[PDB]
């Protein structure tokens, strides 16, 4: 585990806590900039390019049939292999939550310049409310695909929201939604094994299962060490959703998940408590039925990450994490965040 510091070019102030890195054909891209998109990059999607420890954000255009999407600040991202990305929820820079589904895919590729296609999908049926901090995954059962959405954080409903507590959030219901990307339908399922709400959790996707571990609840204000396997069966009739509580979970919130090897995942970062930060990493090795979470060695954290209060970041896709640290008391300029790159 090698930790390496990365210098950023003339646009340090676009990376904010809550960005999301997507991966297309081995190239890394950027989404969720700070503020509304400027005239130098009207789309907000950037070319995440780190080479010899220097980061350059280059603009990326859209196709003519695209929808120009706002920078969402805490969405639910998943890959869907023809290879594309599904995003749901998030925070508009005016601090309103969205319920749209955008599908990002490569329209045409030229010599080191990529044009994207962003399509907004209609969602009818038992739709989820606008939220953030949730997760989405795609499962494959009997030659069909389905999107499994678990709950996150949202505002109070419109008959319960006062202006003295306008920005107060509450955890969503623990229902599980099955999102079909062919027709844009969603059905909810009440499962008795899921009683508490959950947010900022990790969700690993096997063939027909979704392993949901970690998270943080707002009602009891603890981070439970629970692990749930959501098995989805897809017959010709209605689907069958079955949750199963397993031992071996970890008390984890806002962690970063990467896939270094096939059927092998690494949990990096997160928060175990409020004032206490999680400096250990967890190695998750999937199987056909059983999973196990073991210890790996602690990477050599520097002196400014061990004494930082918060971090953020996401997964670049090549078994490599891009995490950030708040800089030298912001001030005017001179870099507000200290970025790093961790390899596995």
């Amino acid at each position: 585990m090698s930790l390496q510091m990365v210098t950023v070019g003339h646009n340090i102030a676009l990376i904010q806590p809550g960005f999301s890195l997507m991966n297309f054909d081995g190239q890394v891209f950027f989404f969720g900039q700070k503020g509304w998109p400027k005239r130098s990059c009207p789309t907000g999607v950037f070319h995440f390019d780190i080479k010899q420890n220097h980061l350059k954000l280059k603009p990326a255009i859209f196709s003519k049939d695209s929808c120009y999407l706002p920078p969402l600040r805490y969405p639910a991202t998943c890959s869907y292999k023809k290879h594309q990305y599904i995003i749901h929820g998030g925070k508009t820079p005016n601090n309103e939550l969205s319920d749209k589904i955008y599908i990002m895919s490569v329209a045409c590729k030229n010599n080191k310049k990529v044009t994207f296609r962003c399509t907004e999908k209609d969602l009818v049926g038992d739709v989820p409310e606008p939220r953030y901090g949730h997760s989405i995954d795609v499962v494959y059962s009997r030659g069909k695909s389905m999107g499994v959405l678990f709950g996150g954080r949202s505002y109070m409903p419109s008959t319960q929201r006062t202006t003295e507590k306008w920005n107060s959030v509450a955890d969503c219901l623990p229902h599980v939604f099955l999102i079909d990307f062919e027709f844009g339908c969603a059905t909810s399922y009440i499962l008795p094994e899921l009683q508490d709400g959950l947010s900022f959790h990790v969700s690993i996707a096997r063939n027909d299962t979704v392993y949901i571990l970690g998270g943080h609840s707002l009602a009891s204000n603890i981070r439970p060490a629970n692990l749930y396997r959501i098995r989805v069966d897809l017959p010709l009739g209605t689907p069958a959703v079955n949750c199963t509580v397993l031992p071996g979970g970890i008390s984890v919130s806002s962690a970063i998940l990467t896939q270094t090897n096939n059927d092998e995942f690494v949990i990096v970062g997160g928060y175990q408590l409020e004032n206490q930060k999680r400096m250990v990493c967890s190695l998750v090795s999937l199987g056909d039925n059983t999973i196990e979470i073991s210890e790996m060695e602690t990477p050599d954290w520097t002196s400014d990450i061990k004494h930082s209060k918060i971090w953020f970041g996401s997964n670049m896709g090549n078994g490599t994490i891009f995490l950030g640290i708040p800089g030298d008391n912001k001030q005017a300029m001179s870099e507000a965040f200290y970025f790093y790159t961790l390899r596995c």
Binding site: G35, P37, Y68, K91, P93, E164, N167, K309, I310
Partner: protein
């Protein structure tokens, strides 16, 4: 023996603190014997009547998404924003009143003036008609607000104030609307009441919407309701018209979903380009609004006609972000005056350097022209050189005597006559957007605004074509295009300016230094309370008892 309201008015209007009023009261009591003033707890009890959250009020029908509790005063400006370690980090201290509580406190302070206006307008006294209150809302960030030591967030060194000012109260009597109130000094610091004080950057969009969204929620909630208030023993009904005009152009571009000032779409009132503004220069109409900006953001975001970036930007006319604050399309008079003065300063530097004859010049030539202009302005106009154009430098610079001083430094005579007609046209056009009622105190100058604007535009196109060929400033286009339309709509520019908000910004630093606790968790509540208490019209009448 003085009443505690009188000692409260004397303490807050003469800028005395509690620690200095205590010394004055203690010395007056210990030397004269009998207690002339009142102690501090009597003044603290007396100021609770004037703060918001004291009087009973009722909305009809009840406002959406607010509580009907009437004893709400200073609350946290974050509005329950979650400061957990997993979410977006907050570094902001904010305190505010509720909007309806601030409105009922302002109306109950203005009670005596409203009754006096109903007496003096040949009206009745127990009338309970639908009063229509017109307010003026303002917002401006500040800089060099140095944060303190101690425990708390990593707060930036800026501040953002939101204020309002009750401008005009009418009543329906018969068919005509008569005016029972009108503010005599609208750009004063005495009537700009504070509403929300936060410590964050004005360019940090996420924090700005996260604090200012409950205010726009309450404002949109009470934009379509009727407030019943017992004024002098009789319940009376109040409708409100909110008019946000106390903003500079940069904040209007930010909160209206428009691009920055260096773009090709230059005007926040019409859909023109900078090239087309320098060719027509007069003939433009006001077309932009808030609903149009919301529809144009939805067109940009959905992209229904399947275009690229440039065609979609030409379709939506630069609206590439969602607006979140409804503002009035108008002109800030103070910043327009400052920008026009800075443009004339650049014209004066270019005309003494013979740029119209020599189009090329080095940088030391421009520095020498600036040095000659600064030395001769100190010699003739007694104006020291400043690098940031003020308003007093603007009021002293736009004179014909300054044109005579600068024309002493120009060898040619046709350039002398060109600058003389330019300043004559500017001084013929300036009293329309600075006077509080140009249909009464300068109606001939209002009537000849379009003719003088066309003459000014022709003079800029002909005699200064080395500077205004294919480009123009935004404030020149605002001054030459939309001013008679804004006068025909609103009745006044300059009354609705952001100058009283800047005078309140002058008061803010004084109250932060010498009228508040020096703690990071306590400064904003004390400054908000004392600035609300300073602008009380009930306490300002005790300081005018001698002329009564």
């Amino acid at each position: 023996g003085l009443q505690p309201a009188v000692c409260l008015a004397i303490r807050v209007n003469t800028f005395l603190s509690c620690s200095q009023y205590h010394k004055m009261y203690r010395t007056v009591k210990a030397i004269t014997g009998r207690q002339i003033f009142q102690p501090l707890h009597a003044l603290r009890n007396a100021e609770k009547v004037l703060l918001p959250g004291y009087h009973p009020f009722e909305w009809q029908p009840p406002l959406k998404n607010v509580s009907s509790r009437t004893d709400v005063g200073i609350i946290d400006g974050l509005s329950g924003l979650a400061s957990s370690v997993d979410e977006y980090p907050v570094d902001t201290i904010a305190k505010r009143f509720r909007y309806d509580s601030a409105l009922v406190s302002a109306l109950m302070d203005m009670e005596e003036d409203i009754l006096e206006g109903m007496r003096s307008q040949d009206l009745d006294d127990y009338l309970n008609g639908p009063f229509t209150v017109v307010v003026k809302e303002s917002c401006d960030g500040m800089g060099d607000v140095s944060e303190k030591h101690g425990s708390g967030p990593a707060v930036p060194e800026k501040a953002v104030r939101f204020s309002f000012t009750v401008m005009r109260i009418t009543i329906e009597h018969g068919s005509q609307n008569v005016k029972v109130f009108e503010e005599p000094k609208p750009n004063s610091e005495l009537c700009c009441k504070p509403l929300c004080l936060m410590l964050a950057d004005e360019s940090d969009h996420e924090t700005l919407t996260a604090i200012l969204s409950p205010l726009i929620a309450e404002r949109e909630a009470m934009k379509s309701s009727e407030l019943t208030l017992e004024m002098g023993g009789i319940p009376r009904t109040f409708k409100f018209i909110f008019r946000g005009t106390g903003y500079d152009e940069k904040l209007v571009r930010e909160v209206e979903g428009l691009e920055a000032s260096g773009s090709v779409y230059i005007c926040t009132l019409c859909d023109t380009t900078r090239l087309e503004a320098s060719q027509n220069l007069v003939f433009h109409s006001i077309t932009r609004s808030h609903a149009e900006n919301l529809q144009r953001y939805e067109v940009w975001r959905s992209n229904p006609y399947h275009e690229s970036v440039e065609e979609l930007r030409d379709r939506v006319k630069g609206v590439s972000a969602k607006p979140f604050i409804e503002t009035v399309p108008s002109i800030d008079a103070l910043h327009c005056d400052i920008g026009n003065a800075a443009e004339f300063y650049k014209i004066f530097q270019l005309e003494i350097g013979e740029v119209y004859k020599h189009p090329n010049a080095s940088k030391e030539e421009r520095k020498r022209w600036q040095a000659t202009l600064d030395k001769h302005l100190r010699k003739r106009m007694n104006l020291k050189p400043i690098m940031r154009m003020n308003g007093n430098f603007a009021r002293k610079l736009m004179t014909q005597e300054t044109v005579d001083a600068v024309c002493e430094l120009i060898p040619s005579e046709e350039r002398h006559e060109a600058l003389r007609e330019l300043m004559d046209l500017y001084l013929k056009m300036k009293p329309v957007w600075r006077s509080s009622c140009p249909a009464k105190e300068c109606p001939e100058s209002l009537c000849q605004y379009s003719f003088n604007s066309q003459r000014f535009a022709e003079l800029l196109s002909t005699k200064f074509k080395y500077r205004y060929e294919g480009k123009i400033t935004n404030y020149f286009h605002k001054t030459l295009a939309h001013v008679p339309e804004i006068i025909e709509r609103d009745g006044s520019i300059g009354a609705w300016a952001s100058e009283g908000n800047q005078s309140g910004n002058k008061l803010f630093r004084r109250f932060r230094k010498m009228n508040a606790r020096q703690s990071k968790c306590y400064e904003m509540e004390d400054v908000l309370k004392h600035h609300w208490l300073y602008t009380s019209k009930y306490l300002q009448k005790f300081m005018n008892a001698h002329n009564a």
